[PDB]
Design an enzyme around this catalytic site. Structure first.
Site, mmCIF file in Angstrom:
data_model
loop_
_atom_site.group_PDB
_atom_site.id
_atom_site.type_symbol
_atom_site.label_atom_id
_atom_site.label_comp_id
_atom_site.label_asym_id
_atom_site.label_seq_id
_atom_site.Cartn_x
_atom_site.Cartn_y
_atom_site.Cartn_z
ATOM 1 N NE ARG A 1 2.360 -5.932 11.867
ATOM 2 C CZ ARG A 1 3.101 -5.586 10.820
ATOM 3 N NH1 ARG A 1 2.567 -4.923 9.807
ATOM 4 N NH2 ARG A 1 4.388 -5.892 10.795
ATOM 5 N NE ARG B 1 -5.510 -0.709 8.974
ATOM 6 C CZ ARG B 1 -4.253 -1.117 8.873
ATOM 7 N NH1 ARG B 1 -3.920 -2.363 9.193
ATOM 8 N NH2 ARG B 1 -3.332 -0.266 8.447
ATOM 9 N NE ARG C 1 5.756 -0.792 11.184
ATOM 10 C CZ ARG C 1 4.666 -0.820 10.426
ATOM 11 N NH1 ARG C 1 4.544 -0.001 9.388
ATOM 12 N NH2 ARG C 1 3.690 -1.673 10.713
ATOM 13 N NE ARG D 1 7.279 -2.678 5.713
ATOM 14 C CZ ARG D 1 6.128 -2.643 6.365
ATOM 15 N NH1 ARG D 1 6.093 -2.858 7.671
ATOM 16 N NH2 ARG D 1 5.021 -2.331 5.716
ATOM 17 C CE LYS E 1 -2.530 -0.967 3.550
ATOM 18 N NZ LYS E 1 -2.639 -1.814 4.753
HETATM 19 N N1 LIG Z 1 4.958 -5.469 -5.711
HETATM 20 C C1 LIG Z 1 5.823 -5.810 -4.756
HETATM 21 N N2 LIG Z 1 6.567 -6.966 -4.859
HETATM 22 C C2 LIG Z 1 7.461 -7.363 -3.917
HETATM 23 N N3 LIG Z 1 7.660 -6.614 -2.809
HETATM 24 C C3 LIG Z 1 6.976 -5.449 -2.608
HETATM 25 C C4 LIG Z 1 6.059 -5.044 -3.576
HETATM 26 N N4 LIG Z 1 5.488 -3.903 -3.222
HETATM 27 C C5 LIG Z 1 6.052 -3.608 -2.035
HETATM 28 N N5 LIG Z 1 6.943 -4.526 -1.657
HETATM 29 C C6 LIG Z 1 7.778 -4.600 -0.424
HETATM 30 O O1 LIG Z 1 6.949 -5.226 0.570
HETATM 31 C C7 LIG Z 1 7.107 -4.646 1.862
HETATM 32 C C8 LIG Z 1 5.773 -4.180 2.376
HETATM 33 O O2 LIG Z 1 5.249 -3.104 1.541
HETATM 34 P P1 LIG Z 1 4.733 -1.724 2.157
HETATM 35 O O3 LIG Z 1 4.249 -0.807 1.091
HETATM 36 O O4 LIG Z 1 5.818 -1.331 3.071
HETATM 37 O O5 LIG Z 1 3.446 -2.213 2.967
HETATM 38 P P2 LIG Z 1 1.999 -1.784 3.337
HETATM 39 O O6 LIG Z 1 1.065 -2.545 2.497
HETATM 40 O O7 LIG Z 1 2.010 -0.333 3.090
HETATM 41 O O8 LIG Z 1 2.013 -2.291 4.796
HETATM 42 P P3 LIG Z 1 1.849 -1.587 6.160
HETATM 43 O O9 LIG Z 1 2.972 -1.922 7.046
HETATM 44 O O10 LIG Z 1 1.989 -0.170 5.937
HETATM 45 O O11 LIG Z 1 0.555 -1.950 6.814
HETATM 46 P P4 LIG Z 1 0.218 -2.200 8.276
HETATM 47 O O12 LIG Z 1 -1.219 -2.486 8.405
HETATM 48 O O13 LIG Z 1 0.963 -3.348 8.762
HETATM 49 O O14 LIG Z 1 0.682 -1.199 9.249
HETATM 50 P P5 LIG Z 1 0.359 0.238 9.362
HETATM 51 O O15 LIG Z 1 1.538 1.078 9.373
HETATM 52 O O16 LIG Z 1 -0.651 0.731 8.407
HETATM 53 O O17 LIG Z 1 -0.391 0.276 10.811
HETATM 54 C C9 LIG Z 1 0.320 -0.264 11.973
HETATM 55 C C10 LIG Z 1 -0.701 -0.496 13.060
HETATM 56 O O18 LIG Z 1 -1.493 0.698 13.227
HETATM 57 C C11 LIG Z 1 -2.834 0.397 13.661
HETATM 58 N N6 LIG Z 1 -3.828 0.884 12.651
HETATM 59 C C12 LIG Z 1 -3.581 1.500 11.468
HETATM 60 N N7 LIG Z 1 -4.737 1.782 10.862
HETATM 61 C C13 LIG Z 1 -5.705 1.349 11.663
HETATM 62 C C14 LIG Z 1 -7.120 1.416 11.479
HETATM 63 N N8 LIG Z 1 -7.778 1.947 10.422
HETATM 64 N N9 LIG Z 1 -7.885 0.879 12.494
HETATM 65 C C15 LIG Z 1 -7.354 0.317 13.608
HETATM 66 N N10 LIG Z 1 -6.021 0.266 13.760
HETATM 67 C C16 LIG Z 1 -5.166 0.767 12.816
HETATM 68 C C17 LIG Z 1 -2.827 -1.132 13.775
HETATM 69 O O19 LIG Z 1 -2.396 -1.534 15.086
HETATM 70 C C18 LIG Z 1 -1.744 -1.548 12.773
HETATM 71 O O20 LIG Z 1 -1.233 -2.851 12.887
HETATM 72 C C19 LIG Z 1 8.148 -3.540 1.697
HETATM 73 O O21 LIG Z 1 9.395 -4.009 2.269
HETATM 74 C C20 LIG Z 1 8.194 -3.282 0.180
HETATM 75 O O22 LIG Z 1 9.510 -2.902 -0.188
#
Ligand SMILES: Nc1ncnc2c1ncn2[C@@H]1O[C@H](COP(=O)(O)OP(=O)(O)OP(=O)(O)OP(=O)(O)OP(=O)(O)OC[C@H]2O[C@@H](n3cnc4c(N)ncnc43)[C@H](O)[C@@H]2O)[C@@H](O)[C@H]1O
Ligand SMILES: [Zn+2]
Length: 217
Positions: free
Chosen positions: A171, A88, A160, A127, A13
């Site tokens: 997660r 979510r 992270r 990552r 994302k």
């Molecule tokens: N095409 C491809 N092919 C191969 N490799 C690729 C690729 N594209 C990318 N990659 C690689 O793959 C890896 C991942 O891609 P990357 O783009 O880094 O991942 P992402 O999909 O953006 O994953 P997130 O970590 O951002 O999501 P998350 O839910 O875990 O945590 P968040 O920060 O939002 O949130 C953290 C915490 O916040 C809280 N939170 C956030 N939002 C909410 C909500 N709405 N409600 C309740 N709690 C929430 C929760 O506790 C949550 O766990 C990278 O190393 C990249 O280089």
């Protein structure tokens, strides 16, 4: 436009978000990033949020909707916005509909990036994040040009705390628990679009581009 980038943890994302901002220059709103900021700020909200985040659980809905309500009501979102990792849950989904219902607006596209669990797990294992800009890299699949240094600002890269195996499995499960229903909600609303994320970063973007660039397909 009014966009929503959803997908399981590690679907790419943020990765795809950086490319969407470049082209259309729309405000990147990531709840994951906002919570991380409150935490770095030391706010009371950040303290309560971290507890759930460290465990890999969702931050309670009321809190999450609250901060999204405030951030979206700001001026740099009238012309459009890119929600990332939100909503979510169904409550979050509805709270977002009403919020925009008042501003005489609506979500126009829900881009659901899909990847199988095993790939998602491999993606989060090796990552790394930029200490300066928040952008991520992958030691194997999407490495930085120069080891340990962000290609945009030379900032240091780090893992992270929650990108560890135990937390990752929790997660992935917690978030999927909300997916199927959330996906139906939007599909019955005629705005959902699944997109094969199990491809090269560039190729996944072209699939996203087609919908954003309006023009039929
Ligand atoms: N095409 C491809 N092919 C191969 N490799 C690729 C690729 N594209 C990318 N990659 C690689 O793959 C890896 C991942 O891609 P990357 O783009 O880094 O991942 P992402 O999909 O953006 O994953 P997130 O970590 O951002 O999501 P998350 O839910 O875990 O945590 P968040 O920060 O939002 O949130 C953290 C915490 O916040 C809280 N939170 C956030 N939002 C909410 C909500 N709405 N409600 C309740 N709690 C929430 C929760 O506790 C949550 O766990 C990278 O190393 C990249 O280089
Ligand atoms: Zn950086």
């Amino acid at each position: 436009m009014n966009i929503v980038l959803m997908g399981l943890p590690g679907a790419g994302k943020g990765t795809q978000a950086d490319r969407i901002v470049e082209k259309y220059g729309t405000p990147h709103i990531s709840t994951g990033d906002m919570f991380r900021a409150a935490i770095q700020e030391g706010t009371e909200l950040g303290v309560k949020a971290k507890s759930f985040m460290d465990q890999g659980a969702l931050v309670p809905d009321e809190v999450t909707i609250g901060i999204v309500r405030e951030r979206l009501s700001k001026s740099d979102c009238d012309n459009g916005f890119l929600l990332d990792g939100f909503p979510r849950t169904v409550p979050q989904a509805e709270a977002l509909d009403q919020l925009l219902a008042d501003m005489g607006r609506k979500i126009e596209h829900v881009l659901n990036i899909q990847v199988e669990k095993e790939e998602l797990i491999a993606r989060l294992t090796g990552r790394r994040i930029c200490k300066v800009c928040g952008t991520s890299y992958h030691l194997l699949f999407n490495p930085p040009q120069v080891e340990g240094k962000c290609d945009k600002d030379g900032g240091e890269l780090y893992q992270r705390a929650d990108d560890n195996p135990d937390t990752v499995t929790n997660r992935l499960e917690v978030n999927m628990n909300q997916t199927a229903p959330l996906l139906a909600f939007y599909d019955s609303k005629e705005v959902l679009v699944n997109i094969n994320g199990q491809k090269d970063i560039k190729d996944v973007f072209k699939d996203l581009d087609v919908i954003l660039q309006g023009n039929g397909q």
